[PDB]
Amino acid sequence: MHHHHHHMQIFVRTLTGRTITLEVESSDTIDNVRARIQDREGIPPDQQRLIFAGRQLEDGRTLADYNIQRESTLHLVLRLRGG
Amino acid sequence: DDALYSRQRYVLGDTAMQKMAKSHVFLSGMGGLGLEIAKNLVLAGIKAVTIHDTEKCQAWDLGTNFFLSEDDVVNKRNRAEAVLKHIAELNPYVHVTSSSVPFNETTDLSFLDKYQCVVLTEMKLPLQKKINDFCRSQCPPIKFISADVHGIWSRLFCDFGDEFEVLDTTGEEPKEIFISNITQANPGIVTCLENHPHKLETGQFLTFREINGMTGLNGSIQQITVISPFSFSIGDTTELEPYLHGGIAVQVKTPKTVFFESLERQLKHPKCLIVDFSNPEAPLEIHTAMLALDQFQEKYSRKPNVGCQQDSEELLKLATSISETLEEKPDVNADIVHWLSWTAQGFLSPLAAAVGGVASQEVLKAVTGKFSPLCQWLYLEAADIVESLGKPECEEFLPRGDRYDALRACIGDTLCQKLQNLNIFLVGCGAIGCEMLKNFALLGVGTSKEKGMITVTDPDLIEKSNLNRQFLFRPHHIQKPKSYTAADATLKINSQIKIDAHLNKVCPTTETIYNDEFYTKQDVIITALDNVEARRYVDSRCLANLRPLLDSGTMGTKGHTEVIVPHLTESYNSHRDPPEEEIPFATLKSFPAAIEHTIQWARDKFESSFSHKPSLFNKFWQTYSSAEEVLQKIQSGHSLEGCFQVIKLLSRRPRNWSQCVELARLKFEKYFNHKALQLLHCFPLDIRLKDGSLFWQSPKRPPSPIKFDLNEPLHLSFLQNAAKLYATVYCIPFAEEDLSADALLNILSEVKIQEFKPSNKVVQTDETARKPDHVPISSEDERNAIFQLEKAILSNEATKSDLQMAVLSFEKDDDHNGHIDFITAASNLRAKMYSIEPADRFKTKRIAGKIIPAIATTTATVSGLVALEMIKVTGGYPFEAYKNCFLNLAIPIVVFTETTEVRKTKIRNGISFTIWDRWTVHGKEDFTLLDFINAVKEKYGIEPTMVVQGVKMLYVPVMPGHAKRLKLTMHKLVKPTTEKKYVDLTVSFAPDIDGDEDLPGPPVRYYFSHD
Ligand SMILES: O=P(O)(O)O[C@H]1[C@H](OP(=O)(O)O)[C@@H](OP(=O)(O)O)[C@H](OP(=O)(O)O)[C@@H](OP(=O)(O)O)[C@H]1OP(=O)(O)O
Ligand SMILES: *O=P([O])([O])O[C][C]1O[C](N2[C]=NC3=C2N=[C]N=C3[N])[C]([O])[C]1[O]
């Protein structure tokens, strides 16, 4: 049977000491989370790499598919170009 | 300070560098890890390092020490004294001293108060605690760092004393926010500009400036509370004047205090940096196991022996007892304990490389107060290298008397020999590339007599400012190739290494050299590049040839590693990096708001004046020969591209040094006076729009004209460098006495300044303008060009010497050419015109030159991590063993993570494919297109609906008459000659829902015969 809706607050941290607090639903897709981050940061979805609990989050899946819960922390990471 | 320190000055800042020029570091233990640390600190420019060691050289040490030679071993030299001269050479500004005095629990530690930081490796734990207690209780505390690698495990510890001041906690520059409205309330609510979230967090402090109306907030400090992405509350503004417009808010960075506990206390209640959040409990489990090893060494005066069941049972028993004394009562991890007992006597050089990078950055934090230090433990480990081995027998790990004993005791002889047999392709040979070659040498890569080869390529010669992060290059190597020099140095580290050094860049124009057969011969490709384009290109080549690729990169304290493995992962190009920042055309040309806008404008003006326009001038007269011919073609109605701009340059050509100064003076008047007056003519300071708002609303800033004054050093600097650059372009000789402020004032003394005359030229205000394309030539302009062309022909001012100009090339690293001085003066004059804060020469150079901050500490760290992943590639490890890493040592923060899972693209009927799939059909001489269609369906499950060869449409059933092609042979259909063996085809299939676009499949390689 259909479940009760489970709203949650999650944190997206950069590797520069910043924290983005997001109001999400557990049924949100990872695609939708990238869209919300674009609204907050101006970063296009195809530049966002999101890490949760040592795994890279991919499109087509939901927060619940990745067992992301209340107060979970995600990391927004980037590749650097120097060498 | 120096051009040797340029790239890293942008990481640390002048204040931190100066403290490093006054710091004395004491480093004890000169095994592999102490050497890595000493190499990093000396490269980073610590003023004085003492390297201490009490041990003699030993054959085993050749496996982990990249400066030791076999002659050192036969003479049994002290380990610190043997490497002293090699370390000193890393930069002659550093004082490197050796010490070999005994160092035990009866040693008077008073001699240590000469040092600001103490770094201890390979030291017994009881003595570490005694030194730690001494250090932390000095009147100013001596900062204390302890670091060790045992087999595949490591332990890093910092104790900077009870209260340590961090002056900059993040390494990030304060952001600026434009204000849109402020309410009169308690608390007052600030709203920032539309479409620009402030990106601030509750609790941060801001200062304010340029607010119009609400007097009392300018010059104040406010602590904010975030309300929405666009608004935050400040203090009480109820009593203040109403807000009108404008205003800029700037983050204030507050120093923070960090508290450290003693080593003794931290052993019982450890604070650990969590580097893999899939296993947040692992660092405490490692802490336990590694404390058990210290207790084993104390109890038995030796490390456990590999394969000795009693030793590992005892280590487990010690680990179990320690776990009971910890607060959480954490279960003992029997796998960690087993592999620690197994490998304790070995030493993993790439792990020491990575730990040594992190530990060296911690030393820099200890003597500078720049960046927040580790607090207090880091447990980098290489367990993913051995888990796939299962539980092997110990025969494969026993020493054999060669330099690889240290490594073999970590990973086993089978994997060592696979490393020795590797063919690897190292693309780029700068900072990362030099660290990689040294890491390859310690691992034995490509040393097998039979197989094995390191191919390294780089198009560049060695320059000054490279000796900072590239430890294989010396000043006497200037003008020598990077790849040749690094290859020769690596052979000194390991004489068995087989290296093939090239002078090429890897790009489309060298694809005939590095062709598919070349990649097919490699086992792994490793990039050491400084740009995104090269990375995406190399990635496309590895993907096309089913070869793994290990990429890495740094920027300052930031770094990454990425693992790309055929059939297991996505490739580099599955993700997009941040593009170069695009300053909008209108912002750059008419409405700057930041110093970055005026610097880019000055860089572009240099390019326009001294490179682009001279070369257009040259190519024009080369194409059209002489001035008489152009004059005849203009009067006969012809139009030549760029002709009117060329004639303008021809007519205004300066003839002597005096006219070069006059031209430079004229450009000052145009750029920094007339431009301001023209914008104010189009948009008066008080002009308003239809919505009643001011046109000069944030981020727009009104210009104000500048009056030329040779007594202003900024004005003199512009005039000097503009005049000497124009003299260079127009081939006018000049002496350095012609540059004096006295000589210049005389040349301009009787030179009239043309009064400003406005125009009704249209200036674009759209933030999405992007150039006005090309304005059509007017009838007046053509008439003026003919007048100037005749005037030049009549006065013999169109000879061969007049039809050419010298083209300059922007060179940021030569201070005598005036390029940077021109850019800095022009940028700061434009900034002053717009009331923007100017920037000094070093900041202007960084931004104009696109210089990427770099420091050897990060570079050594990511290179060590890449070498660990390369061991996994060599062994054909499963997907879960691999790790990408994303890190920033400023925080510090290290995020290991599984790499990108390969994605499946669905064709139809459950048939999917990945980026790695390639399909094959083997035909014969009479094999028809119908045979090809049936062969794909039988072998792969679905019938093609389209067959394409590049752009040739071989079979498209919806095109009229293509059914006749089914009966044609594949020979007559394709017509092959270049590749006699096969042809690569693009095959598509019928979609699930009729009428949609056909679905593409894997590339299909068709072989014409059976060979
Ligand atoms: O070629 P650019 O680097 O884009 O500079 C041009 C150039 O200025 P300078 O050549 O003196 O550096 C034009 O002058 P001409 O050489 O064509 O005579 C000038 O045109 P005006 O003098 O008629 O104003 C124009 O300015 P604008 O487009 O505002 O009319 C200005 O453009 P920028 O300095 O903005 O690049
Ligand atoms: O980061 P460093 O500047 O110390 O070294 C970068 C290194 O990479 C080389 N490089 C850039 N682009 C390349 C390339 N090598 C091979 N192919 C391509 N496309 C550059 O010369 C630097 O020395």
Author numbering:
A (entry chain B): -6 to 76
B (entry chain A): 40 to 1050
Article, verbatim:
Prior to conducting crystallization trials, human Uba6C625A was mixed with Ub and ATP·Mg2+ to promote adenylation, and diffraction-quality crystals harboring two complexes in the asymmetric unit (AU) were obtained. After extensive screening and refinement, a structure of the human Uba6C625A/Ub complex was determined to 2.25 Å resolution, with R/Rfree values of 0.166/0.206 and excellent geometry. Remarkably, the two copies of the human Uba6C625A/Ub-adenylate complex in the crystallographic AU exhibit drastically different architectures relative to one another. In one copy, the adenylation active site is completely ordered and the SCCH domain adopts an “open” conformation where the catalytic cysteine (C625A) is more than 35 Å from the glycyl-phosphate linkage of Ub-AMP that is nucleophilically attacked during thioester bond formation. An additional surprise in the Uba6OPEN/Ub-AMP structure was the presence of strong electron density corresponding to an inositol hexakisphosphate (InsP6) molecule located in the SCCH domain.
The E1 enzyme Uba6 initiates signal transduction by activating ubiquitin and the ubiquitin-like protein FAT10 in a two-step process involving sequential catalysis of adenylation and thioester bond formation. While Uba1 is specific for Ub activation, Uba6 exhibits dual specificity for Ub and FAT10 5,8, the latter being a Ubl involved in mitotic progression, immunity, and implicated in cancer. Two distinct architectures of the complex are observed: one in which Uba6 adopts an open conformation with the active site configured for catalysis of adenylation, and a second drastically different closed conformation in which the adenylation active site is disassembled and reconfigured for catalysis of thioester bond formation.
